[PDB]
Design a protein around this nucleic acid. Structure first.
Ligand code: MG
Ligand code: MG
Length: 758
RNA sequence: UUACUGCACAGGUGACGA
DNA sequence: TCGTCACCTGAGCAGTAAC
C-alpha cells in the first residue's frame, strides 16, 4: 500500500535566528536585497522584512532579533532553499529561478537520435533538445498538523534552434511566416518578435510584429516550437524526418518513462545528498529519504477510489466499467423516454465530396458491419432510434476558395432550409484548408452560428476524418455518435453516485482566451456548467448562455442560487436536510467571492436546511509525480516485449499532500497509448481554505468520476466536465460574439436540452 | 473542426499579502 | 504601485482509440 513521489525530504534545523523590521512598503525590498547581497538572505512577508545572515561581516542591519522555528514557519527556509539549491549545483547555470531550473551538461538528444536513425545533415548540430531539470522546494504535511519541506524533481526537454537564420535560408528553408524570438531577452523583455516577412541586408522584415517591424538577423532566432522543428527538419531531411522524430521520442523515453524517471530522480537525490547543503556558513540542510505516500504508522496518505461505473438506467442494474461496452450492451441511459426517434439531419458538404460523404453517412447511420466490431450496428440501432432522415445540402465550393467559402455554405443552408421544413440537427463537412481560416471567413464558425441561431445543433467534421481508414473510422464514429445523440438532447450515460445527502450540486467555470493572432491581446470569456446528484447518478443540468469575463463571480452566484431554488422545489427538502454545493475551476476563487457566494446560497436555501460548500481547483501543471513501483505495465500492443504504463499508478489513486490538497491519478496503464509515453503527471486537487465542506478525498473522487462524464468521447476527459464543457462553451460563445447575424436567442429555447457545445 | 494523449514553445496570468 | 508563490491557455505537432 505505497506510492512513491519525485520528492526528497529536506532535513532542516529546528530553528534559525533572524533579524526583523517593519517594512509596510515593499517597493523598498529590491534595493535592500541588493545592498545586503552576499551577507544576508532577505524575505518580505506580512508587511515585515526578515533577514537571515549567510556570511560574517557587514553591512549592519537594525531590527528585532527573533527565532523562527521551522516547524511553525517553514516558508522562510523553503524560500532560502530556492537559492541554496542553486548554490549547491555551482557547475549548472540557472536557466530559471524559483524553481531552480537547469540543463544537462553533456546530454543532447538530436545528435543521439540522428545517429540512432542513421540520419545526418550539416545543420543538425544547431537543433538542440537538452534535458531540463527543475528542483522545487515544496511544503507538505505527512500527517495533519506537521509540515515538512521536500525538494521535488521534475524533468522536461528544452527545444532550441540555435542556427543562424542566414544559414537556414541558405540551406533552402522557406522562413516566410515562421515565428522568430529574441536570442537575448533583456530584463523583463518580450521574447516574441513576430513572423518572418523576408530578409533584406543583415535584417529580418517582420509582419504580425510585437514591437518594431524589423530586427537584425543576428539578434533573432526561430522560436523553439514543434512547428519550427518539423518545418526545418522536413526541409532538411524529409520525409525521412519522421524517423528522426520517432528516434527523438525514443531518446526522451530514456528520461521520462516511469522506471527511467524514477532513476533520474534517484540519481538527482544521490547527488544532492552527497554533502550537507549550505543554508548559511554555520547552518546546513540534508536531503533525506524519498517521500512516499502510504498508510504506514500514523500516516493515512493513500487511497484507491473505486472504479467509476458508467450507468445506463435509473435502476443502477445496467452498468459497465467502460462507456462503449455499456452503450453497446444497454443502449443509452434515456432510451425509454427519448422523444425524437426519427431525427431529420441536414448534411452540408462541398458538392465534390458527395461520394465520400455518402459512404461516411451510411457507415454512421447503418454501421460498418460485423467486420468492424467497434462500430457494427450504426447510430440508429446503437441509440434505439427508428430511423434517421438525411437532408442533403451540397455546396458549390472548392478547397482553394479562401475568401468566400463561408458565404457559400450559409447561402446554401438558407436556401435549403426555406423549403425543407424542420431539421433537428446538422452535419457540416469542411475542407481541411478551411478549418482554421480567420473567423471572418471561417465556415466552421459561420455555419455553427447560423444553425445555432436557428436552433439546430451541429456536429462538424473535416474531410481527413471523413476519409479515415476503417480501423480508425470505427472509434471516430463511436465519438461522433455519442456527441450527436447528446446534441439531439440525448443522455448517453451517467456515472454512479452513492446517495449520501439530501441534494448535491456541482458548478464549474471555464475560461477561453481569444484573439485573431499572437500580436493581438487575448480577450477572456467564460462558461458555466452544472451537474446535479440524482438517485444512483450524476445528471447534467443547464449551461450558461452569457460568456462575460467581467462579472463572472456574479454569474456563478446567479447560477448557483437559481438552481438551488429549482432543486428545493423539485425535491421538496425537509427541515434538517443537508445540501452540498461544490465549485470546480482551474484557478482558485478570491476569498471575497467565496464569501459572497456562500452568503447568497445560504440565504437562498434558508434556515430550515444545512449547507456545506466546497471550492475546488484542479491543476494540471504542478511539480508532483506519483510512481507505483509494483506496476509492471502492459503490452504496448499485444504481444510485444515493450511495455507501456510501467510504474503508472492506477486510475483513482488519491494521495494526500497536505490538509487541502490531494493528488489524483487519472491515466492508468490501460489508458496510456504508447510504450514511449512518459509517466503521467497526476491532477492536483486543492480545496479553498474558506470551504465549509472539507473532505478533499471525496472531492478528488468526485472530480475523477466527472472525467468519465464527457460525451465528446468514449474515452475519459482530462478534466471534470464541469470545467471542460465550460471551456468549450466559453470558446464557442466568445467566437460567436463577433460573427454577424449570430443571436443566442435559441440557446435557452430550442437548444435548452441540446449538448450543442460538445 | 470525431476525439484522446500532452509535448513543445509562446503569451503571460492568477491568488494571497502589506 | 510592490513582494511572493504559483501555474493556466493557445498554436501546431504527432501517435493512438480502456476487454
Ligand atoms: Mg465537438
Ligand atoms: Mg506540459
Amino acid at each position: 500500500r505505497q506510492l512513491v513521489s519525485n520528492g526528497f525530504e529536506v532535513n532542516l534545523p529546528d530553528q534559525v535566528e533572524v533579524i526583523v523590521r517593519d517594512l509596510p512598503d515593499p517597493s523598498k525590498v529590491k534595493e535592500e536585497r541588493t545592498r545586503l547581497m552576499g551577507y544576508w538572505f532577505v524575505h518580505w512577508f506580512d508587511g515585515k522584512l526578515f533577514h537571515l545572515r549567510i556570511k560574517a561581516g557587514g553591512p549592519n542591519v537594525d531590527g528585532e532579533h527573533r527565532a523562527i522555528r521551522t516547524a511553525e514557519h517553514p516558508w522562510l527556509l523553503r524560500a532560502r532553499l530556492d537559492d541554496a539549491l542553486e548554490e549547491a549545483l555551482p557547475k549548472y547555470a540557472a536557466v530559471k529561478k524559483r524553481p531552480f531550473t537547469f540543463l544537462a551538461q553533456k546530454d543532447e538528444l538530436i545528435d543521439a537520435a540522428a545517429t540512432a536513425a542513421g540520419l545526418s545533415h550539416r545543420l543538425l548540430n544547431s537543433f538542440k533538445v537538452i534535458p531540463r531539470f527543475a528542483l522545487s522546494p515544496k511544503i507538505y504535511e505527512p500527517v495533519d498538523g506537521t509540515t515538512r519541506v521536500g525538494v521535488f524533481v521534475t524533468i522536461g526537454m528544452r527545444y532550441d534552434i540555435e542556427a543562424s537564420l542566414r544559414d537556414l535560408l541558405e540551406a533552402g528553408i522557406d522562413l516566410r511566416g515562421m515565428y522568430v524570438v529574441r536570442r537575448k531577452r533583456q530584463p523583463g523583455e518580450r521574447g516574441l518578435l513576430g513572423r518572418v516577412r523576408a530578409i533584406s541586408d543583415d535584417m529580418v522584415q517582420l509582419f504580425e510584429e510585437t514591437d518594431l517591424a524589423s530586427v537584425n538577423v543576428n539578434d533573432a532566432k526561430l522560436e523553439g516550437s514543434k512547428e519550427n522543428f518539423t518545418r526545418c527538419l522536413s526541409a532538411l531531411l524529409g520525409h525521412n524526418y519522421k524517423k528522426l522524430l520517432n528516434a527523438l521520442d525514443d531518446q526522451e523515453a530514456g528520461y521520462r518513462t516511469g522506471p527511467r524517471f524514477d532513476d533520474a530522480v534517484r540519481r538527482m537525490g544521490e547527488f544532492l545528498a552527497k554533502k550537507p547543503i549550505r543554508l548559511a556558513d554555520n547552518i546546513n540542510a540534508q536531503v533525506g529519504d524519498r517521500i512516499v505516500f502510504s498508510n504506514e504508522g500514523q500516516a493515512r496518505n493513500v487511497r484507491l477510489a473505486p472504479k467509476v461505473e458508467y450507468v445506463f438506467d435509473r435502476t443502477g442494474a445496467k452498468s459497465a466499467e467502460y462507456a462503449w461496452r455499456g452503450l453497446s450492451q444497454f443502449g443509452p441511459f434515456d432510451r425509454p423516454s427519448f422523444a425524437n426517434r426519427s431525427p431529420r439531419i441536414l448534411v452540408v458538404y462541398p458538392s465534390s465530396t458527395q461520394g465520400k460523404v455518402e459512404n461516411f453517412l451510411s457507415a454512421f447511420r447503418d454501421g460498418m458491419g460485423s467486420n468492424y466490431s467497434g462500430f457494427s450496428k450504426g447510430f440508429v440501432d446503437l441509440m434505439g432510434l427508428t430511423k434517421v432522415e438525411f437532408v442533403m445540402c451540397p455546396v458549390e465550393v472548392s478547397s482553394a476558395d479562401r475568401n468566400g467559402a463561408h458565404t457559400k455554405y450559409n447561402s446554401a443552408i438558407e436556401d435549403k432550409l426555406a423549403g425543407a421544413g424542420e431539421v433537428h440537427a446538422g452535419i457540416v463537412v469542411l475542407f481541411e484548408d478551411h478549418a482554421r481560416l480567420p473567423d471572418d471567413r471561417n465556415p466552421y464558425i459561420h455555419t455553427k452560428s447560423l444553425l445555432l441561431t436557428l436552433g439546430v445543433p451541429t456536429q462538424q467534421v473535416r474531410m481527413p476524418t471523413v476519409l479515415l481508414e476503417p480501423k480508425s473510422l470505427q472509434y471516430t464514429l463511436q465519438n461522433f455518435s455519442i456527441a450527436t445523440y447528446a446534441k439531439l438532447n440525448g443522455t448517453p450515460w451517467t456515472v454512479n453516485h452513492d446517495k449520501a445527502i439530501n441534494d448535491e450540486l456541482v458548478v464549474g467555470m471555464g475560461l477561453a482566451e481569444l484573439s485573431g493572432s499572437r500580436t493581438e491581446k487575448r480577450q477572456r470569456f467564460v462558461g458555466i456548467t452544472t451537474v446535479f446528484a440524482g438517485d444512483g447518478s450524476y445528471l447534467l443540468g443547464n449551461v450558461s448562455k452569457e460568456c462575460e469575463y467581467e462579472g463572472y463571480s456574479d454569474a456563478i452566484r446567479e447560477s448557483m442560487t437559481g438552481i438551488l431554488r429549482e432543486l428545493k422545489k423539485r425535491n421538496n427538502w425537509r427541515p434538517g436536510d443537508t445540501v452540498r454545493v461544490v465549485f470546480h475551476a482551474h484557478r482558485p476563487l478570491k476569498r471575497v467571492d467565496v464569501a459572497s457566494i456562500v452568503f447568497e446560497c445560504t440565504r437562498e436555501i434558508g434556515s430550515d436546511q444545512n449547507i456545506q460548500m466546497a471550492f475546488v481547483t484542479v491543476s494540471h501543471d504542478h511539480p508532483f509525480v506519483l510512481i507505483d513501483r509494483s506496476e509492471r505495465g502492459l503490452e504496448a500492443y499485444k504481444g510485444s516485449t515493450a511495455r507501456k504504463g510501467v510504474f503508472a499508478p492506477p486510475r483513482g489513486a488519491i494521495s494526500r499532500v497536505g490538509r487541502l490538497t490531494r493528488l489524483l491519478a487519472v491515466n492508468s496503464p490501460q489508458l496510456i497509448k504508447r510504450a514511449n509515453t512518459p509517466l503521467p503527471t497526476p491532477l492536483l486537487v486543492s480545496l479553498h481554505p474558506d470551504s465549509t465542506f472539507k473532505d478533499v478525498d471525496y472531492l478528488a473522487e468526485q472530480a475523477l468520476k466527472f472525467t468519465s462524464l464527457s460525451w465528446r468521447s468514449t474515452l475519459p476527459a482530462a478534466t471534470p466536465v464541469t470545467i471542460f464543457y465550460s471551456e468549450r462553451i466559453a470558446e464557442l460563445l466568445g467566437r460567436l460574439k463577433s460573427i454577424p447575424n449570430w443571436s443566442s436567442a435559441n440557446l435557452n429555447i430550442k437548444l435548452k436540452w441540446s449538448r450543442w457545445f460538445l
